[PDB]
Tab-separated table of C-alpha atoms in Angstrom:
chain	number	residue	atom	x	y	z
A	1	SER	CA	0.091	0.036	-0.015
A	2	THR	CA	2.152	2.981	-1.386
A	3	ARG	CA	1.428	6.447	-2.332
A	4	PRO	CA	2.904	8.783	-5.135
A	5	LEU	CA	4.775	12.206	-3.978
A	6	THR	CA	5.885	14.515	-6.676
A	7	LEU	CA	9.134	16.401	-5.520
A	8	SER	CA	9.013	19.140	-8.456
A	9	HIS	CA	10.549	22.478	-9.502
A	10	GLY	CA	9.892	24.218	-12.667
A	11	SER	CA	9.834	21.847	-15.904
A	12	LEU	CA	11.672	18.747	-14.009
A	13	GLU	CA	10.181	16.416	-11.322
A	14	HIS	CA	10.883	13.137	-9.490
A	15	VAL	CA	7.776	10.638	-8.340
A	16	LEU	CA	8.694	9.503	-4.842
A	17	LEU	CA	7.089	6.212	-3.562
A	18	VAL	CA	6.035	7.034	-0.085
A	19	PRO	CA	4.557	4.196	2.218
A	20	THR	CA	1.119	5.218	3.530
A	21	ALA	CA	2.156	4.627	7.177
A	22	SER	CA	4.274	7.606	7.184
A	23	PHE	CA	2.934	10.312	4.541
A	24	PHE	CA	1.708	13.004	6.856
A	25	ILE	CA	5.324	13.437	8.012
A	26	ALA	CA	6.837	13.448	4.299
A	27	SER	CA	3.847	15.505	2.682
A	28	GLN	CA	4.824	18.392	5.232
A	29	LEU	CA	8.431	18.254	4.333
A	30	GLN	CA	7.283	18.691	0.628
A	31	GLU	CA	5.434	21.995	1.471
A	32	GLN	CA	8.350	23.232	3.787
A	33	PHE	CA	10.951	22.153	0.918
A	34	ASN	CA	9.121	23.725	-2.140
A	35	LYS	CA	9.218	27.289	-0.685
A	36	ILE	CA	12.825	28.252	0.504
A	37	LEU	CA	14.216	27.415	-3.234
A	38	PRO	CA	13.769	30.525	-5.393
A	39	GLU	CA	11.622	30.743	-8.593
A	40	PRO	CA	12.486	28.902	-11.820
A	41	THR	CA	14.171	30.425	-14.991
A	42	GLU	CA	15.056	28.492	-18.252
A	43	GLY	CA	18.675	26.624	-18.044
A	44	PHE	CA	18.116	26.363	-14.228
A	45	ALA	CA	21.577	28.210	-13.955
A	46	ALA	CA	20.725	29.632	-10.586
A	47	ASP	CA	23.114	27.569	-8.097
A	48	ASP	CA	20.477	27.428	-5.299
A	49	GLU	CA	18.250	25.474	-8.003
A	50	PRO	CA	18.658	21.924	-9.601
A	51	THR	CA	19.569	21.743	-13.311
A	52	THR	CA	18.850	17.811	-13.517
A	53	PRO	CA	16.252	15.621	-11.391
A	54	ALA	CA	19.461	14.049	-9.752
A	55	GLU	CA	20.318	17.364	-8.182
A	56	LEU	CA	16.661	18.136	-7.135
A	57	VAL	CA	16.885	14.789	-5.095
A	58	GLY	CA	20.062	15.785	-3.739
A	59	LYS	CA	18.744	19.294	-2.692
A	60	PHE	CA	15.929	17.301	-0.687
A	61	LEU	CA	18.375	14.893	0.923
B	1	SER	CA	2.912	-2.096	-5.868
B	2	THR	CA	1.930	-0.617	-9.440
B	3	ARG	CA	3.280	3.000	-10.840
B	4	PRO	CA	1.484	5.663	-13.078
B	5	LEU	CA	2.878	6.319	-16.562
B	6	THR	CA	1.136	9.068	-18.643
B	7	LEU	CA	1.391	8.462	-22.283
B	8	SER	CA	0.266	11.881	-23.642
B	9	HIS	CA	0.224	14.027	-26.795
B	10	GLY	CA	-1.169	17.748	-26.665
B	11	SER	CA	-4.491	17.942	-24.856
B	12	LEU	CA	-5.368	14.319	-24.504
B	13	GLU	CA	-3.532	11.447	-22.465
B	14	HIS	CA	-3.914	7.856	-21.043
B	15	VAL	CA	-2.647	6.949	-17.602
B	16	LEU	CA	-0.843	3.442	-17.823
B	17	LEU	CA	-0.915	1.225	-14.758
B	18	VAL	CA	2.963	-0.177	-15.044
B	19	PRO	CA	4.190	-2.754	-12.547
B	20	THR	CA	7.432	-1.307	-10.636
B	21	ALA	CA	9.305	-4.473	-11.453
B	22	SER	CA	9.549	-3.627	-15.259
B	23	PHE	CA	9.383	0.226	-15.241
B	24	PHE	CA	12.960	1.155	-16.352
B	25	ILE	CA	12.008	-0.574	-19.890
B	26	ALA	CA	8.648	1.101	-20.255
B	27	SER	CA	9.711	4.523	-19.258
B	28	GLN	CA	12.469	4.535	-21.898
B	29	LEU	CA	9.677	3.589	-24.464
B	30	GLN	CA	7.723	6.611	-23.190
B	31	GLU	CA	10.609	9.038	-24.187
B	32	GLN	CA	11.618	7.314	-27.439
B	33	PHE	CA	7.822	7.250	-28.417
B	34	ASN	CA	7.160	10.904	-27.522
B	35	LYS	CA	9.602	12.168	-30.193
B	36	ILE	CA	8.948	10.546	-33.529
B	37	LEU	CA	5.380	11.914	-33.719
B	38	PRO	CA	5.077	15.615	-34.865
B	39	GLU	CA	3.764	18.805	-32.677
B	40	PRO	CA	0.280	18.939	-31.938
B	41	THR	CA	-2.104	21.179	-33.461
B	42	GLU	CA	-6.149	21.917	-32.614
B	43	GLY	CA	-8.409	19.336	-34.271
B	44	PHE	CA	-5.337	16.755	-34.283
B	45	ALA	CA	-6.302	16.259	-38.030
B	46	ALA	CA	-2.625	15.363	-38.755
B	47	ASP	CA	-2.635	11.607	-39.919
B	48	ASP	CA	0.556	10.769	-38.102
B	49	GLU	CA	-1.174	11.956	-34.857
B	50	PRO	CA	-3.988	10.718	-32.707
B	51	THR	CA	-7.394	12.492	-32.625
B	52	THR	CA	-8.740	10.191	-29.554
B	53	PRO	CA	-7.284	8.678	-26.613
B	54	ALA	CA	-8.036	5.371	-28.062
B	55	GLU	CA	-5.987	6.064	-31.241
B	56	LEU	CA	-2.831	7.327	-28.927
B	57	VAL	CA	-2.946	3.753	-27.364
B	58	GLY	CA	-2.937	2.259	-30.841
B	59	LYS	CA	-0.079	4.262	-32.026
B	60	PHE	CA	2.027	3.130	-28.972
B	61	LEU	CA	0.730	-0.501	-29.428
């Protein structure tokens, strides 16, 4: 019994498979994480932001 | 333990229920399929493209 969570920023995203036992924890991290990083701009050249989906998971971790 | 894949083109899409055991195969088909067909144009009258979600699954098959 899993549940999808989409860690996303601009035009790239990663689908995270979150167990439903602890989703109320992970979904509140999703909102708190998606506000500190600035506004997306084509090329994603801003060093605070990820350029690739691999970097976005890194920024979350 | 299933996983959503969205076969999509323009304004119509079908959600495909892919088992997670073989998703690395199916997700690479999704990228290779979504590049050979041309750019969407309202009415979807182009014969290379689908007009209906039924045709889009047909084009994939």
